[PDB]
Design a binder for this molecule. Sequence first.
Ligand SMILES: Nc1ncnc2c1nc(Cl)n2[C@@H]1O[C@H](CO)[C@@H](O)[C@H]1O
Length: 385
Amino acid sequence: MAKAAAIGIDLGTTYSCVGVFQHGKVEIIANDQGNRTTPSYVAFTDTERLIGDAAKNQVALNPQNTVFDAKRLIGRKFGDPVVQSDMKHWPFQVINDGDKPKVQVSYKGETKAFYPEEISSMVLTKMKEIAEAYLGYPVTNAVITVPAYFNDSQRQATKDAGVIAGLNVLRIINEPTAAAIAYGLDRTGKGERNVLIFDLGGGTFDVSILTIDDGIFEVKATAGDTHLGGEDFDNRLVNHFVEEFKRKHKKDISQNKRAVRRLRTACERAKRTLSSSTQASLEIDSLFEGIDFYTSITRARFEELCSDLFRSTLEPVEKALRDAKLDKAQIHDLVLVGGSTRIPKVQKLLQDFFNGRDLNKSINPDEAVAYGAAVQAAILIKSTR
Ligand SMILES: Nc1ncnc2c1nc(Cl)n2[C@@H]1O[C@H](CO)[C@@H](O)[C@H]1O
């Protein structure tokens, strides 16, 4: 029953996703708000702890006690220059406990501090409960994914997050490996198969090159930008619309925190529409000083607004190829991961770089990692019997 069942969890920087492989198919499990992905957010309020959508939904109202980006801290020492640099950009406090970072917040009127694995365990507990509500029984066996570049300390702290969350961690597998498994790229028989995974998420960009030799995965190269993602594109739309409001009304809205956040969420939404329509409409009632902001933008203008950022995704692709010592024509498969890979200009830039090549994109790119993890979790639990 429950003991013969296992889930796959993509514990993402900005979003997490849970899948289950049963009756010959993967089911990506929708949360209680009907969302197939859940924000990797934990909010501490005057009455409760919120996880996911409810936590992300109140971020503007409670920024000091709304934790996100715990994955950027997990398995790292406080003195790590990555931690010291990132800390300057978070509204929540990060403290030092014997060279280990802890996120410090106010919860039920009291000061509490949590290890990154404790924050990540609350996100994992949510994914576990989402799977349990779907299945109708508790599932505790899980495969959890991590970036291919995670070292041993980061892998161990992710496993620890799983244990705190009440999960039996069958295996910690690499995100690009789970994505290649999702497409069955490890079951093409014999011979070395070179796979490039192009993963453009909400806050990070990862390029991975893998060689699959008779089911055995080998990481040949990892490249990318840990601070490039979908939210930078939301921000480029924000600056455009702030400048358009100034042209129409001779008013600068950039200092009105509420106006900027309402514009930001509307921009994120319009950006998604621009992936399947050639225009998107913004409909903001009383954006600033009672002024409605009913406007639109073409996909052509959005592409211009992010042109440099879209083009910058090709440098880590080239870098990964040189590190792996492979030319473009030596790559057998191209895989899209991360919601931002739905952007047509991004697909076009990658396909053109690979000389008109087809892309593996039939699986929801924000779901491919959990999909593969769910497949692996099923194989692993079956071998355990
Ligand atoms: N249809 C889409 N067109 C463009 N961007 C998208 C789309 N869907 C998602 Cl999710 N994202 C973005 O992916 C990230 C999460 O993986 C977020 O930045 C989200 O906006």
